[PDB]
């Protein structure tokens with residue numbers, strides 16, 4: 001049972017700009033996703049202080065980076081707060097509208113794509129390297145969901161019947177044919193060291 005949705009006009013515009021603009025410094029997508037993972041882990045850690053039962057779906061707070069050359073995927077996994085169906089379909093897109101407009105205007109005023117995170121829309125930098133993005137997420141109050149988009153103005157949401165993840169988010173980057181350098185161990189290590197060296201959670205780079 002797959003539900004198909006149209007992105008709000010501003011988000012479809014942002015995704016097109018990210019796909020179409022010539023911009024060589026694509027590596028910045030990784031810092032954006034790791035930073036989102038880190039914010040999600042802070043959120044579950046904060047909530048657990050007043051309600052300890054929120055860690056019943058997993059005590060460990062961490063980030064895994066999983067490359068897979070056979071599937072041509074790079075997966076960012078976290079055991080953070082996770083997302084609800086409402087976040088996936090409408091809540092995040094609503095907040096994204098404001099950030100998208102501010103980012104588009106900043107670009108016209110002379111800013112570059114690396115500043116995307118300051119506008120709360122850093123997640124869409126995934127499309128600098130990915131032809132398709134799959135998001136598997138599980139929030140304590142909701143079910144496990146799979147969000148997916150190859151851009152083109154639409155995204156899908158389905159109940160994920162795959163392997164339960166307990167609590168957290170998995171961002172699966174189906175890389176563009178010319179972006180396989182992001183499956184290489186030394187390339188991932190270099191980017192993490194350059195942009196994500198001060199994240200307060202363990203980041204484990206899996207090897208193939």
Ligand SMILES: C#CCCCn1c(Cc2cc(OC)c(OC)c(OC)c2Cl)nc2c(N)nc(F)nc21
Nearest residue numbers: 036037040081082083088092096120123135147169
């Ligand atoms: C913006 C923003 C941050 C909030 C949404 N979000 C994101 C980025 C994100 C933003 C989105 O819109 C702006 C969004 O679209 C609905 C999205 O889902 C595909 C994600 Cl993953 N990553 C995580 C994560 N790792 N864990 C949790 F829990 N929430 C996340």
